[PDB]
Subunit: 243 residues, 6 copies
């Protein structure tokens, strides 16, 4: 027996935003909400009206003239509902017709050279959380039993990201993201461990969403804001080039 | 309260294959079933008639004149029933009187030098799946609370494996297996991480079975078929030398 | 809904040891019980009378004239009740008024230079067990949603530990502890992995207790007895310097 | 934590049947489906698209020119999901704006004088199923902790039912319904017991729906078809008089 | 595995009310709290500090110079925690050393002759709630697997109750109590059913407490206040005669 | 997902008692074990080796030259595993090929005229336990969703029972059995209620087994030993007449 939540959400969303087919889905991490404020004809639906959504709202509309859907707030593994916490919502994005997920998140740097305030485009990841989202019976309605994470962080969209960054005057390093369960922060040794292992950025999310997206064949693009304006411009510039 | 499934299986098996004491237990991974076709006086019992067995069949008989039991199909961690999924079945092998488990599995190589089509004898492992099979109350009927994994992959049988490989004309490299939860495949970074960590082969099984076997003092021998005739000969030749 | 066990324990303990405010809390690992025998006016309460305590006793009294509470026996992740197994007990120490937790444990060395019989002061840790103690809804009564593990193993108390060791004639090396789920022991490859990762000591506990302690702002001090008199003197000398 | 299913259903229903405020809600028992075939501008929604609905469809439209909602199929206690199986659906009727529930069901007679083919208007009930629908935390959003079942089977609507029956030429006896868990049928002694107790009709449903309805202040009208055209006319005539 | 809550409560209670051995335990139903206000040297403990107690307080002290323990508030079957909801608390009364339970409760009359305002001494009961408190593994520490309810409502104490009632000028009828699950009130037919069955009073509690009391050999006395000063005098007079 | 326990038991039983097709299945209540001692070529299997069987043994063999299976010990509702506790075992009897279940049990009389020591043939029953065995998804492999209890206590076999009783010189009264959950015994009022309701005998079992038997079309015969040699003769005489 599988979840029908995405299907329910499709119908509930038609009620608040009819005849709307979004192309890009966004997940706005921590302090990144202020962007959704600029959505054209913005319609907000509380996650409490969308079954399966990570109750702590979702905003539908246009940005740079592109039909977009946004998630103001995400779910994390540390909340206690396992690695499947972001799966229904991602499946909802796929069923809505989106062609790509634009994930954003607050994170720590594992490189001295990249400090607080920097933005990092994620090119791959190392999962350290226990297990994975698709563990359990496979939902054939969304994807196959086994699946590849090769090019999970779409190389093509990443190249566009690089161009936009040029285009506006800020670095945009590319890195390997390594997930951490939390909610406690990482010990210094764990951090050294992560460097040795090959990581560049460390955080408590992303991996669940991304693996879930790949399973249902939704393309991914992810950018971390290193916490220890540029982001808005990067996003709006990316939107402009894909319009 | 503990599982009595192995005990039940012993009695159920006497009904289909009386007065039979197998010496070697096999787990035939993915495309490796065709071997069981060559078992002498083969009797097949569906896993649905054996409590505790990983319902997706078990074949009892003789091979190279050696009393053998053989699992066509195994259980994995990614199925959602935790790390204990292969434990009852291994305990059943021990109670049947087997003296060694011959585990086989499909896997990926972490060494460029060993490619698709190669066979690798596992000499050790690195567990990356969350937790382990014996976590929880200890079943004193099968083994002790704590136990060593030293020489888990029996050095002696491994040496025989090396001889047989000579004996038939194919390389038989030895490696460290590192388990991965799945069901998604590994990211490239995860793969690099595994190299750095010391691994040679990567897969989604083995570890549960092997740790379970060691706990009840069942000797182990494991060979991976790198997927990204020789196997049959290796197995039959090993059987011949232990007869 | 949260656990009230620590609160219950406070009242139950007043009954056996009234008007007593301990300053240091101890966790005596495996063969380390004989120390509790030297507690002044020792009162022993079975863990079976203390809700939340890891039923396999707790001893309250004075040592070197310092009000102390001691756990003879701890809980481990391998027992099957998850990473929260030591949390209620640590919260009980905090509510009793302790200002520091003195954790002890049996462990293996990852350095050739430090062998069986050595004592190692833990200066940091690398968690390898699945998830962490605070995963799930946060208990605001004890600590915050997020928290830092910086200086988790108090540098100050560690310096005192160094002095005492001088003071009595034995080495006291400092190391990074890396937790392992167990109950099986580590494979040799896993051990190599741990070296590469940066570890110095390996064990099956500590991490749960320590993270739990930090969450409720209880200072920590941890010493491992490498298993593959000095300990008593170190503890008693530390007590003397903090009196 | 309470169910939000009724709320979800409201939004899902707006999508298939916008600007529609039904006044009467029907539950069509066993062989009573053929009535829904006569609904004007009938829109059918499968219970699989309505969270909380007893998956074995719901039909919205007009009948005798009255805005109506109809459940083709109900849930029973014997299915194993307890006495709350019909609660979400009834709450959905209340939230849709219905002013009365018209429950129908197949049943057995406890009076010799009323035989197979007869119709009986239920005037009260005796619950024999274990417990009741509202057992557990009270959902203040729908009703109060305690509530009266006085006049549960609305006397007023029952009088209208009596008139219509005159009006078309068939008896319409009034009786006390006594619920039975099932799924087995009643023993003869149980049946005698029910007579002695004061019952007139016996069945395996009704009680859950009715108690749930009363809790959220939804008026009720119930008619049993004794199994061991008139019904259609009675319903259509009742509708005509309340239009 | 059994509940140790009563044992915990014993120790927690020693802390707030040391060297106190109560003889009578009271359960004050609905509007009956005002009595506890007259307890001598009253000590109140919130049910939130007593594990196993029906969180919606407990008062210990003397009344008519008799050591007494009171429960201001009880647990009911309709709350959703089954028929064992009052068991731990009753066991706590037994372990405290009480020799009798004085249960009180608000109830409805099944006899026209006994109306609102009347008091009825319960002489027996008919359980209509699903199952019973002792269903499941038997706790040998408190009572036997099977036990008799003969004279459950102690005839001797009931006779004293009759004398006191004379003694103060009010009727005191004796009746059979029949429990009802609730939380809804009874239908009129259910009420007729109860009359036919032999009942005199109807309510939503009592039975759980009483059966639990009998299992651990605690004597019982129960009085219902029919809701559809005398009570205080009856209680105080009973206390006086047993002092 | 359904239970396969009966199927497992079939195979396990072939191992201890091959080529054996029993015709009558017995359930020996309390003090009734001594009968199984007289089974010809008796083979005993502990319920611990038969999945689904009510662990507190099963005896297979011949009696009066009739192939028989016999349960020494049954499961009851009061044990806490619900009304399905005897279902797997009864299904096992059906699959073994039995044509009738001969249930026996210890019970109380509701008639003054029938006292301790009497035997009563059950002709019908009144279920007072919460719910019934078949509640939940129906196992089509054994029976239908709905089923009749008419002639549940086979009239034909009952007539034979009457003859045998003549034949040996003892009364054999026929009665209506009414089940009671227990484990406490019935109150006197409950007993009066049972009389009024139409019962003749009262007990804590039978109903689960019997309803389960009827569902899978197994004929039933039940005899209660009123507790508040003749039985052996009745059974052996019945066997003789059906041989
Ligand atoms: N895990 C983790 N999450 C973060 N979010 C922001 N900074 C950090 C950090 O250093 N670690
Ligand atoms: N985890 C894992 N399992 C495999 N089975 C076959 N190939 C692979 C691989 O690359 N990775
Ligand atoms: N995990 C682990 N725990 C230990 N406790 C004592 N020695 C060891 C060891 O080598 N490994
Ligand atoms: N319980 C029950 N339900 C029915 N539905 C139709 N007839 C009957 C009957 O006799 N009993
Ligand atoms: N069940 C029930 N409880 C009550 N408490 C007070 N009055 C009543 C009544 O009529 N019925
Ligand atoms: N329920 C019940 N079971 C019994 N078993 C033997 N006697 C009795 C009795 O009086 N009541």
């Amino acid at each position: 027996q599988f979840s029908h939540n995405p299907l329910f959400c499709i119908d509930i969303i038609k009620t608040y935003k009819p005849d709307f087919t979004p192309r890009v889905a966004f997940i706005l991490g921590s302090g990144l909400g202020a962007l959704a404020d600029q959505i054209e004809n913005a319609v907000a639906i509380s996650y409490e009206k969308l079954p399966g959504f990570p109750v702590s709202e979702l905003v539908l509309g246009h940005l740079q003239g592109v039909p977009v859907v946004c998630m103001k707030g995400r779910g994390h593994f540390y909340e206690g509902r396992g690695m499947t916490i972001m799966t229904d919502a991602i499946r909802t994005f796929k069923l809505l017709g989106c062609e790509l997920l634009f994930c954003t998140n607050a994170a720590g740097s594992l490189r001295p050279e990249v400090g607080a305030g920097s933005l990092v485009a994620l090119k791959d990841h190392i999962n350290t959380m226990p297990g994975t989202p698709m563990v359990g019976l496979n939902d054939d309605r969304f994807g196959e039993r086994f699946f590849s994470l090769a090019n999970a962080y779409d190389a093509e969209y990443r190249a566009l990201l690089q161009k936009v960054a040029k285009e506006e005057g800020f670095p945009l390093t590319e890195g390997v993201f390594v997930s951490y369960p939390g909610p406690n922060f990482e010990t210094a040794a764990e951090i050294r461990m992560m460097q040795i292992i090959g990581g560049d950025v460390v955080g408590m999310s992303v991996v669940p969403e991304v693996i879930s997206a790949r399973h249902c064949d939704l393309k991914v693009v992810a950018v971390s804001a290193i916490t220890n304006q540029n982001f808005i411009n990067l996003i709006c510039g990316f939107l402009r080039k894909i319009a």
